[PDB]
Design a protein around this ligand. Structure first.
Ligand SMILES: Nc1ncnc2c1ncn2[C@@H]1O[C@H](COP(=O)(O)O)[C@@H](O)[C@H]1O
Lengths: 20, 229
């Protein structure tokens, strides 16, 4: 269940870093 | 050929075999028979295309990261490969959207199903928007917003603030504002409101879905925590 959360965090964070 | 329950069985097999294109092909065929989908079929269809399009979205992102590297026939090679992926992505999202517009949204009986399918339509126009450009991007962005909005209004009216579908819709709609419209402002606003409203009415949780509600409530706080910087 922290598996869903961590995966969501990664996916979202990608947008912030690689395309501001 | 195969009947509904055989197709659904095939779809369940594909899923465990992690053959998501197969799983989607099966659920696409069930949908095309034209009857309202059970909750189980509906979720199998969603899981199938989420994984199918997810693989392409992932690959698109990897290549894009790489592409941001200073030579250029290697950047010309990488660009053409991104386009190849984009084209696959567009075919997937258009298959889904056709399914939603031809069968699912129009036939959905309960407010629950209609919100679910309209959120799905928001999602898959949002995925087109991640890779679209020029005039096509305006079209896909507007259609994404339209579906999210219609679903948003219907859920505020028909569902408790702790319903998992309503919360999920809010999560994705806020992600739409943040990542697609570049509106950190209204994204956080949307996320925070959806969370607060759920908190206020914790008494609306129920046995079947209280775990899903709290998880999504948590994703809302996470996105929020992640965005406020
Ligand atoms: N059909 C669905 N049911 C539940 N959660 C979903 C569904 N589709 C997308 N999500 C969530 O939406 C969030 C946004 O991620 P994405 O839509 O992949 O950018 C993810 O962390 C998923 O948990």
């Amino acid at each position: 269940r922290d598996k869903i959360r961590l995966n969501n965090a990664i996916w979202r964070a990608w947008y912030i870093q690689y395309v501001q | 050929t195969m009947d509904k329950s055989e197709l659904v069985q095939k779809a369940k097999l594909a899923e465990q075999a992690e053959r998501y294109d197969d799983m989607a092909a099966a659920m696409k065929a069930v949908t095309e028979q034209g009857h309202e989908l059970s909750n189980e079929e509906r979720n199998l269809l969603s899981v199938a295309y989420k994984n199918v399009v997810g693989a392409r979205r992932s690959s698109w992102r990897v290549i894009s990261s790489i592409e941001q590297k200073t030579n250029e026939k290697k950047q010309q090679m990488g660009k053409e490969y991104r386009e190849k992926i984009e084209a696959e992505l567009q075919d997937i999202c258009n298959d889904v959207l056709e399914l939603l517009d031809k069968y699912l949204i129009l036939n959905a009986t309960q407010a629950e199903s209609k919100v679910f399918y309209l959120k799905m339509k928001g999602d898959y126009f949002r995925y087109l928007s991640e890779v679209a450009s020029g005039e096509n991007k305006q079209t896909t962005v507007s259609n994404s917003q339209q579906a999210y909005q219609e679903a948003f209004e219907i859920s505020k009216k028909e569902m408790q603030p702790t319903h998992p579908i309503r919360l999920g819709l809010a999560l994705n709609f806020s992600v739409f504002y943040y990542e697609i419209l570049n509106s950190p402002e209204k994204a956080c606003s949307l996320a925070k409101t959806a969370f607060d409203e759920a908190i206020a009415e914790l008494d609306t949780l129920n046995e079947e879905s209280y775990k899903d509600s709290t998880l999504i409530m948590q994703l809302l706080r996470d996105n929020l925590t992640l965005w406020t910087s």
